[PDB]
């Protein structure tokens, strides 16, 4: 019954992606 950190809308971000998943985007096996 107490409120919980549950996403309300389908396009809501309840918790931040954080650093580790953020750096995954920058990954590219092709050398620059």
Partner 1 sequence: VRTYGGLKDQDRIFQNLYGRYPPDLKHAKKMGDWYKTKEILLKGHDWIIGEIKASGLRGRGGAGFPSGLKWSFMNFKDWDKDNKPRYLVVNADEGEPGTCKDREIMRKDPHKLVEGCLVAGRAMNATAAYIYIRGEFYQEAAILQNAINEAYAEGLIGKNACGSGYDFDVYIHRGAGAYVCGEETSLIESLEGKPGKPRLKPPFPAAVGLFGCPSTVANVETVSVAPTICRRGGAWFASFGRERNHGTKLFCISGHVNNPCTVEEEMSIPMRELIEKHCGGVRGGWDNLLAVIPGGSSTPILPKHICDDQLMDFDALKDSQSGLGTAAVIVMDKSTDVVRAISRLSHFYRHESCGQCTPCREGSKWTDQIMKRFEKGMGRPREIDMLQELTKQVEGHTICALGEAFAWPIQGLIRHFRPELEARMKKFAEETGGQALAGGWTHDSRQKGRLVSPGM
Partner 2 sequence: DTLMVHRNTPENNPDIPFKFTPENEKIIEQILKRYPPQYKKAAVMPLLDLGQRQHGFCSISVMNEVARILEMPPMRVYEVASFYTMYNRTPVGKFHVQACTTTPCQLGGCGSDAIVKAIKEHLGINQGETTPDGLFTFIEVECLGACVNAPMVQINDDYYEDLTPETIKQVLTALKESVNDVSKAPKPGPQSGRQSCENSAGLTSLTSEPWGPEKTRPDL
Contact positions vs partner 2 (CB under 8 A): 2-7, 10-18, 21, 24-25, 27
Binding positions for partner 1, rule: CB under 8 A: 18-20, 22-24, 26-32
Choose from partner 1, partner 2, none: what does 32 bind? Cβ within 5-8 Å by kind: partner 1
- Report the first-to-last Cα separation within the chain, whole angstroms: 53
Q: Are 6 and 16 in contact (CB under 8 A)?
A: no
How far is the C-alpha of 28 from the C-alpha of 32, rounded, in Å? 9
- To the nearest whole angstrom, how small is the minimum distance from the Cβ of residue 6 to partner 2? 4
């Amino acid at each position: 019954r107490p409120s919980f950190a549950i996403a309300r809308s389908p396009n809501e971000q309840v918790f931040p992606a954080g650093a580790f998943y953020e750096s995954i985007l920058r990954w590219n096996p092709n050398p620059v």
